[PDB]
Amino acid sequence: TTTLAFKFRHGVIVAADSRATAGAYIASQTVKKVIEINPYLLGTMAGGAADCSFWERLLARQCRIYELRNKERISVAAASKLLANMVYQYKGMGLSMGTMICGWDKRGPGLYYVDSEGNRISGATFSVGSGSVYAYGVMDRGYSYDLEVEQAYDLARRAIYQATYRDAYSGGAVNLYHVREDGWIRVSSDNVADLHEKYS
Amino acid sequence: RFSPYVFNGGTILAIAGEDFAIVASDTRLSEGFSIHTRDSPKCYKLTDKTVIGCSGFHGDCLTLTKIIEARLKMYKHSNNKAMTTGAIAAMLSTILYSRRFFPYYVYNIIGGLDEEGKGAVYSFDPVGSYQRDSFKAGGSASAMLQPLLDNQVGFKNMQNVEHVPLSLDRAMRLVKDVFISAAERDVYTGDALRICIVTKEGIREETVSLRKD
Amino acid sequence: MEYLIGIQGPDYVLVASDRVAASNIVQMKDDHDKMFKMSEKILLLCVGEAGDTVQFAEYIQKNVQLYKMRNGYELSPTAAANFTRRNLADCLRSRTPYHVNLLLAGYDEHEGPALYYMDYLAALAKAPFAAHGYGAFLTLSILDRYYTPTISRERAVELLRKCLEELQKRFILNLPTFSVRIIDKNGIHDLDNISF
Amino acid sequence: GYDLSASTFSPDGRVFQVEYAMKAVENSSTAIGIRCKDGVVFGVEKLVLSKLYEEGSNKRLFNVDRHVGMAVAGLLADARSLADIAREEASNFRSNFGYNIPLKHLADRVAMYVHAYTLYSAVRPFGCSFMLGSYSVNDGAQLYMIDPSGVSYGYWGCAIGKARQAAKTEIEKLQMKEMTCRDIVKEVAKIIYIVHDEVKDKAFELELSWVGELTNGRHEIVPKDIREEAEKYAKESLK
Amino acid sequence: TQNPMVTGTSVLGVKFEGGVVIAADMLGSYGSLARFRNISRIMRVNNSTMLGASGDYADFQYLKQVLGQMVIDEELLGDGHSYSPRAIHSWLTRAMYSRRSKMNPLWNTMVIGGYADGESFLGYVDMLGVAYEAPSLATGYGAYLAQPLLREVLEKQPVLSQTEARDLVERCMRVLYYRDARSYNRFQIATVTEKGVEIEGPLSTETNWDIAHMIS
Amino acid sequence: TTIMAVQFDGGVVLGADSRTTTGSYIANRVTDKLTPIHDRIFCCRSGSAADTQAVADAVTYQLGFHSIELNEPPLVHTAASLFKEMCYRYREDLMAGIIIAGWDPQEGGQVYSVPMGGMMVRQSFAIGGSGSSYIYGYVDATYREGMTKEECLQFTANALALAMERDGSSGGVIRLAAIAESGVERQVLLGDQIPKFAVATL
Amino acid sequence: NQYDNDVTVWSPQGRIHQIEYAMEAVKQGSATVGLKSKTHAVLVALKRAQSELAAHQKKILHVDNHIGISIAGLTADARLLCNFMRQECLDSRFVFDRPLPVSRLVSLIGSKTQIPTQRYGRRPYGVGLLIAGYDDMGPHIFQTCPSANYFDCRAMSIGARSQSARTYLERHMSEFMECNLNELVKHGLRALRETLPAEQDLTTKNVSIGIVGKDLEFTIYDDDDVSPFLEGLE
Amino acid sequence: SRRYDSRTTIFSPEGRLYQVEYAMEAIGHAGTCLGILANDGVLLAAERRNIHKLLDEVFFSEKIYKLNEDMACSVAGITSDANVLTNELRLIAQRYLLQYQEPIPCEQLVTALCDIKQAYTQFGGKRPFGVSLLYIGWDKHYGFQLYQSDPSGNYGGWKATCIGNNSAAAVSMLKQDYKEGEMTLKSALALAIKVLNKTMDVSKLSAEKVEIATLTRENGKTVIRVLKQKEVEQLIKKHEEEEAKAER
Amino acid sequence: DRGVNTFSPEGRLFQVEYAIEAIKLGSTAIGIQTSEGVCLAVEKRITSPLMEPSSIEKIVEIDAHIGCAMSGLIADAKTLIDKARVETQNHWFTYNETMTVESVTQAVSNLALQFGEEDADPGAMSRPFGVALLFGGVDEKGPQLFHMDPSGTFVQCDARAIGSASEGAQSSLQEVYHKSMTLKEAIKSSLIILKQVMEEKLNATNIELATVQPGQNFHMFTKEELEEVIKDI
Ligand SMILES: [Cl-]
Ligand SMILES: [Cl-]
Ligand SMILES: [Cl-]
Ligand SMILES: [Cl-]
Ligand SMILES: [Cl-]
Ligand SMILES: [Cl-]
Ligand SMILES: [Cl-]
Ligand SMILES: [Cl-]
Ligand SMILES: [Cl-]
Ligand SMILES: [Cl-]
Ligand SMILES: [Cl-]
Ligand SMILES: [Cl-]
Ligand SMILES: [Cl-]
Ligand SMILES: [Cl-]
Ligand SMILES: [Cl-]
Ligand SMILES: [Cl-]
Ligand SMILES: [Cl-]
Ligand SMILES: [Cl-]
Ligand SMILES: [Cl-]
Ligand SMILES: [K+]
Ligand SMILES: [K+]
Ligand SMILES: [Mg+2]
Ligand SMILES: [Mg+2]
Ligand SMILES: [Mg+2]
């Protein structure tokens, strides 16, 4: 798996590959690893497939309850915190999950990394998964808070692509989302074989 | 150390068409180097519109299918309608995850009709990760079947071919071919192939002979 | 891997901590803060296992703040240190132990400045200066060499900056920036980050 | 008032709630048991309160173990609950000790359970009396009766419900020690017909069961043909 | 049970026209020691159903106690309903699965034979809750030595007479005596038909040792 | 340990050696392994001494209480059933191999084995303990249907003596008991009273 | 009086007024009828509508493929009991892989509903059921009461003015065993119709029907689906 | 059982809690007990009810209890109830010390006990404790302190007060003689004796009939002492000499 | 004095009857179900000009497709409303589909008789809920309105009023309702009826109104949207 996200002037870019594996067997090339928690919040998935899907779905349930009870959108901070507090009780039991919680709330663009080890941290850019090291190299060399929107799309797409190329456990398609002040949009889905054609 | 699991073999397969779904499985039940029985299908009717294929540890296949049966009735009693193919799939995901720390050793594939009358396949891992697919192989020979389905149904790695809709007749011919190919190489797949075809008219059944060795 | 330091002078305590959050071979954050404000005149600096560190520090922080709300005044650095210790020790043999190492820095109106050291086992020691992490192995002797009890805050920051330069020189990990804060009669002050 | 709780004695040392529960048994129609040479026979006057009911509805005769019958009078829901208690006790005894529970011990155990409902404001006494019957080669024929207070005694003949006394006086005329179950069934039926008030309660079913040498120590319903002959004998004897 | 103690070896079963026959030797082994040489490893459950158990004999005795009591409970009601062979096999599947799922199995592999409503029933259940039905079954070494002979005959002739099924079972019991070092030449044969369940024994097979003089 | 019991017409004979070992130290050379459970029901104990003593005490309690309630002597079968229930239920936490033998008015002399694992089986005669291995052949060849009490006693004493010679974990004295309607008769064979069979010198 | 507030207080006549009062909850419910032939068991119920714009309360509930109920009394108690029955049925199919025999399920109801009649601070169930089922012993109609007693019936009616329905059923019950299904449901409807004020009639808005038998899983007919059965009450 | 439950924890129609009130009547009949705060210390003075000739005198007081190093209390009302509460106070004060490694501040100990008393008025169906308490102490936040609690779980701080027999009269005399900010332990002592002299009007005041404890600070340590009978007679003597001055 | 689970001679639980009487102390709410959606309207019952009207919430969102109007002892309604919310989210979680209006109503109504003082947990419900509820929404059955009361009885209604003037309002509802009525007509009708029954003069701050339509999610009317509707009335 490779997933990344980054805050910038125009919100938050969120991208992922689409491969699933069972050991070395490629189980799928069409997995959706960005889950739509609500129309202003996304969660990304890396690690145990069932674990990510279940715990992010549960986070979505909880954020919706919150919103019903309190009559307002949950913050990115509070959402990420709910997830951290849920998984903390299970440390040591072998859950494997690495997520980015990506939104835009009253503090502006928001990006938290949360995982099954107990980490919860805010930051400007992250990459998560077996291919993260490869995505970081490319994302790091091109990142700027003042990227133009289309430049940011290009960067995210390229970083995941380059990760799929080196990492046996990443591949398929790159799925890209943009969190803007009035909601996220789905920006593209590009098969890595079509991106290869293009980038040479 | 008592082991609570054993591998009993079995291959499952599902294909979504425009107005049909196929769920297919071999009928061999194995243990070690032995055959328990040659007449043990891995397909289970859930509703008029939904069939599930289950393989892996037979003890868990039996238990899980009985749980699913009970839950379908419980749903119908509280909600006054049969569960849809998609709601069965979402539910199964949660039943599998409830055993996250002592899993059901079962590979599940659901085939059925969605709410628009179209073919639907959902495929699962043992702890309930799942998605919708156009087609999927599972169980003992899944690595043998899946690449061929990728190529012949997905049209992968082929240039200059019209991506036509999959006819029932072609999908049937594919299912029989891949199981026959699998019976040649997987020691666990054999005896007979059971095919369920789900359409608006209902669920019908064909059976084809496979090698007995 | 995580570095904490404290140095207590005659009327202040200075503290610093690295700003890295790491994972496997990568720094994932370079502006991480490992200090938790407990009260106007108390910082708790906490490192150790992921999840345990924040869960433990925030629990202590909320209970200290609760005590303030219940009673109208704050827990002394020494009381807070002993409260922290009781909780850690009480969990040590429980189903939920917390794998954390700490420094507690504070200023009391009547006792003056205090610096407390605690390990994951919940041994508590009051010290004129202290450090945690692998970086402590390379900096404690620098502190023993140059500290005096009357050290001024201008010289304490210089001494701190010898310790941090020694990590740049000699430590195998890349810890390029540090949070620095001082506590005295007038509360908690943020100083400039020390960076390389 | 002193009659609201089973945990309150009256000033004369009575427990009126237990007495009231006994009144519920005494309002019920009559059941009888007779022990004889080779077994025990039960009969019940089973009032039929609607013609809409099936034959056999609201049985008052139960199998509580393969060798043990139970015959009841009083509030039927309470009696059935007691039959479940008896069943569970017989089952548990077999599991723990590895043989069929002796009748007397079963009687004493269920009687203590009944008794436990006579001490407390938290619960009420059972509104039922019941007979237990068995037969084996080793223990012979045995017939016990248990009332709402939890008292348990053994009997040659027994009757419970509203025509109890009239039944007993008819039972006293038999030399039951020298008779067989096959002879006694007729006499059971006869006595139910005698004590039945055909004016006040219009329709009844005779229920009959037995356990004896002739059933090999199994408690069983009297076969249909034998019940019908016994009814016909009782009816003609009434003349 | 974590560690089986006294154990029984193979149980065989085969369907025939009008019923089912099962077979089991009368031995409880304690490791290699042929310790208890006259024990029955077959239970009449009720009139339509019988059971044979491999594996730990104490665990079998427990199942016999539980199942026997369940049948009595049901007979007490005298209500025209009885557990079918299929119901008993279902129950047994659940009980074994459930004990396996507590990491505390009943250490048995079982063969359920029955006859009800004109149908022969033959079902397998193991300690893990693996259960299925088939025209013939054989647990333990029988799976290797008896089952091939059962299935070969059944492919040529799927419908056996009672006496044919009985002869075939005797031939398998002989083979097992020759080749399973935990077998014993004293066995029971149990049969269920319309008429009920009959258990015969103790029985022995003839054996031939001519091959003892064919080495040189 | 070696333990044994044998049925005859009207009763039973029980026997045991008297050795208790920790490793290969003899912690008791005159152990009494035949413990009375009721007036005419005994158990022979092998395996863990702590386990068999605890289990036997418990069963004695259960059986005594049961017996008072019923106002009748208890069944040998009942005593065995109580042992079995406890030995089976706790089979993972006990090391106990028990023979229950005795007399009751309903079934006469009876012998039951409750070996480790907690199965229960009635037998004409039973052996157990570590030394029993060395006397299977002997008892198989020597047992005859219809032995008298005195013959059962000799057959027991001989079997036990042979076991005791060969099994390092058995030895000391032979304790015997005979149980019948008239009561329990206990005796000890020691020293030269133990049956003797030569070492086979050249 | 001092004897009517606690289900644990026997009166001096050997009665339990709380149980009698619970039975009044059923007598005040809308009427329902249950009857059987050799092959089918039918339930017929009148639905009371709160306002002229309310749907009409559900009277008939699915329990399992072979069992359905009709209710009279406290609807919340009816659901609680119905959920108990459902669960007992599921348990039996899970364990034994066969339907729970109807008479056994009714036994379980008796035992469950007796318990609170004997404990302080508990109360009876304030509901009566007609239970239609089909098993190896054929079709059944059972009746359950707040007293925890139950009855095996050739036919039955409970609820308001059910005496009339009971009279009709006694009058025609010798015909029931041999009736085809249409005939039998017609009889159920005619019986139910006797409970009505003389003005008023059975309509598709007020009648609910439940049928199970040899060929037929428990099925509920409401609204437009009752019209075939209502036409040719000829 | 609903018939026998006297319903100790319910409101009456005017929003009252009858038990609490009734318990307050029990207290008003118990031994008079006063507390007086000074600049250099705090004191408790109490009427002894243990006064029969044949009593033995075995403890250092009758109704004055040490709670921890820095605090004491006295009580008016049901004695056995007071023993439960004072035991609980000592526990609370050690729980704190264990956890924080400093003495529990006075108001915090009082409030913790008062929360237990409150619970007993709100749930659990039990009778409340029939005890009012006066607490004296020193802590490093507010120095010398005097608190009063009653069976409602209510408490307050006072410069001087009284509970028990003739409370109202005792408080009047305190209102009039107490000099806010200007009392010493010596003048508080004189005042305590003046007050008890008036409010024990059944009858002529004697050392055998009162108990006095003082709480002072000496060299950074709290000292809690129960005055010996020699000292109590001396103060009674001094008050009786003083009333001889009263006209000329 | 008797226990909370005591039956009257008429076969009714005293506590439940008494709880039904508390519903009459509530403000009037109205629900109407049309083929174009359902509306829910409620009298606020302002007792002082100093009270903030927007802090009276007697119509709540359960989920996007389901609203709920309450009358009676409003504080009691909170746990019911939260149970409905949690249940619809559980159903979504498990089944990935919206829960039906009927099903939601059923789930909540299963709480109704769960009170008593010697079956249950150390401090379980001591009395029934003094509240009636109208659940209005859209599911695959189309638009739907369901009523529930403290007996746990629930039923679908084409139009229903609850609270103080429900008799009255229910009569006017029989008079004006028809199956083919539009949503806009139903909105006007329920404001006309509230206007009759309300002690105060109706205006855009002392009522609330919400709709749910097949098109569109739960929607609370703004001041401005109320003012528009109020012009005709
Ligand atoms: Cl994709
Ligand atoms: Cl929330
Ligand atoms: Cl952070
Ligand atoms: Cl990964
Ligand atoms: Cl009587
Ligand atoms: Cl044997
Ligand atoms: Cl048997
Ligand atoms: Cl010993
Ligand atoms: Cl053994
Ligand atoms: Cl042994
Ligand atoms: Cl041994
Ligand atoms: Cl020895
Ligand atoms: Cl009704
Ligand atoms: Cl109701
Ligand atoms: Cl009744
Ligand atoms: Cl009625
Ligand atoms: Cl102290
Ligand atoms: Cl202290
Ligand atoms: Cl209303
Ligand atoms: K093959
Ligand atoms: K030896
Ligand atoms: Mg082969
Ligand atoms: Mg941990
Ligand atoms: Mg041990």
mmCIF file of N, CA, C and O in Angstrom, chain I residues 129-148:
data_model
loop_
_atom_site.group_PDB
_atom_site.id
_atom_site.type_symbol
_atom_site.label_atom_id
_atom_site.label_comp_id
_atom_site.label_asym_id
_atom_site.label_seq_id
_atom_site.Cartn_x
_atom_site.Cartn_y
_atom_site.Cartn_z
ATOM 1 N N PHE I 129 -41.988 6.739 30.248
ATOM 2 C CA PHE I 129 -41.639 7.985 29.618
ATOM 3 C C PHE I 129 -42.904 8.789 29.431
ATOM 4 O O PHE I 129 -43.823 8.312 28.800
ATOM 5 N N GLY I 130 -42.880 10.041 29.878
ATOM 6 C CA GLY I 130 -44.050 10.945 29.726
ATOM 7 C C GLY I 130 -44.138 11.708 28.408
ATOM 8 O O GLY I 130 -44.402 12.906 28.432
ATOM 9 N N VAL I 131 -44.036 10.995 27.284
ATOM 10 C CA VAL I 131 -43.779 11.570 26.011
ATOM 11 C C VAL I 131 -44.499 10.874 24.940
ATOM 12 O O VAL I 131 -44.546 9.649 24.954
ATOM 13 N N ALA I 132 -45.043 11.629 23.982
ATOM 14 C CA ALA I 132 -45.482 11.021 22.725
ATOM 15 C C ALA I 132 -44.602 11.525 21.582
ATOM 16 O O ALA I 132 -44.044 12.634 21.674
ATOM 17 N N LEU I 133 -44.512 10.733 20.506
ATOM 18 C CA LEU I 133 -43.591 11.030 19.406
ATOM 19 C C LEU I 133 -44.227 10.764 18.069
ATOM 20 O O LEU I 133 -44.964 9.784 17.893
ATOM 21 N N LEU I 134 -43.941 11.683 17.132
ATOM 22 C CA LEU I 134 -44.269 11.534 15.730
ATOM 23 C C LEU I 134 -42.942 11.412 14.932
ATOM 24 O O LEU I 134 -42.107 12.330 14.998
ATOM 25 N N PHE I 135 -42.742 10.271 14.264
ATOM 26 C CA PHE I 135 -41.591 10.040 13.418
ATOM 27 C C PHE I 135 -42.083 10.240 11.990
ATOM 28 O O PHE I 135 -42.985 9.572 11.547
ATOM 29 N N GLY I 136 -41.525 11.221 11.294
ATOM 30 C CA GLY I 136 -41.838 11.480 9.890
ATOM 31 C C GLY I 136 -40.598 11.370 9.013
ATOM 32 O O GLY I 136 -39.531 11.874 9.339
ATOM 33 N N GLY I 137 -40.733 10.650 7.919
ATOM 34 C CA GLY I 137 -39.589 10.404 7.064
ATOM 35 C C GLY I 137 -39.943 9.761 5.744
ATOM 36 O O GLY I 137 -41.131 9.594 5.397
ATOM 37 N N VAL I 138 -38.887 9.444 5.000
ATOM 38 C CA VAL I 138 -38.989 8.835 3.687
ATOM 39 C C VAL I 138 -38.037 7.643 3.666
ATOM 40 O O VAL I 138 -36.874 7.761 4.053
ATOM 41 N N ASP I 139 -38.533 6.491 3.223
ATOM 42 C CA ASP I 139 -37.706 5.294 3.021
ATOM 43 C C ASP I 139 -38.217 4.645 1.734
ATOM 44 O O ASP I 139 -39.009 5.256 1.014
ATOM 45 N N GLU I 140 -37.810 3.423 1.424
ATOM 46 C CA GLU I 140 -38.309 2.776 0.199
ATOM 47 C C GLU I 140 -39.817 2.529 0.164
ATOM 48 O O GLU I 140 -40.342 2.276 -0.910
ATOM 49 N N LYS I 141 -40.516 2.571 1.305
ATOM 50 C CA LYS I 141 -41.978 2.547 1.297
ATOM 51 C C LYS I 141 -42.553 3.891 0.846
ATOM 52 O O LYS I 141 -43.745 4.008 0.683
ATOM 53 N N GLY I 142 -41.723 4.909 0.629
ATOM 54 C CA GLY I 142 -42.210 6.272 0.353
ATOM 55 C C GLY I 142 -42.246 7.063 1.651
ATOM 56 O O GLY I 142 -41.647 6.656 2.654
ATOM 57 N N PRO I 143 -42.920 8.219 1.646
ATOM 58 C CA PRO I 143 -43.066 9.031 2.859
ATOM 59 C C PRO I 143 -43.915 8.347 3.917
ATOM 60 O O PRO I 143 -44.859 7.614 3.594
ATOM 61 N N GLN I 144 -43.596 8.617 5.166
ATOM 62 C CA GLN I 144 -44.212 7.909 6.242
ATOM 63 C C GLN I 144 -44.215 8.611 7.564
ATOM 64 O O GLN I 144 -43.218 9.175 7.985
ATOM 65 N N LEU I 145 -45.363 8.505 8.227
ATOM 66 C CA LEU I 145 -45.558 9.111 9.528
ATOM 67 C C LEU I 145 -46.038 8.054 10.493
ATOM 68 O O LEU I 145 -46.986 7.330 10.216
ATOM 69 N N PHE I 146 -45.382 7.997 11.639
ATOM 70 C CA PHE I 146 -45.693 7.007 12.632
ATOM 71 C C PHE I 146 -45.859 7.735 13.960
ATOM 72 O O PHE I 146 -45.123 8.703 14.267
ATOM 73 N N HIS I 147 -46.813 7.251 14.755
ATOM 74 C CA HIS I 147 -47.024 7.780 16.098
ATOM 75 C C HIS I 147 -46.651 6.757 17.142
ATOM 76 O O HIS I 147 -46.980 5.582 16.985
ATOM 77 N N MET I 148 -46.077 7.217 18.241
ATOM 78 C CA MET I 148 -45.836 6.363 19.376
ATOM 79 C C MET I 148 -46.174 7.064 20.680
ATOM 80 O O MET I 148 -45.868 8.233 20.832
#
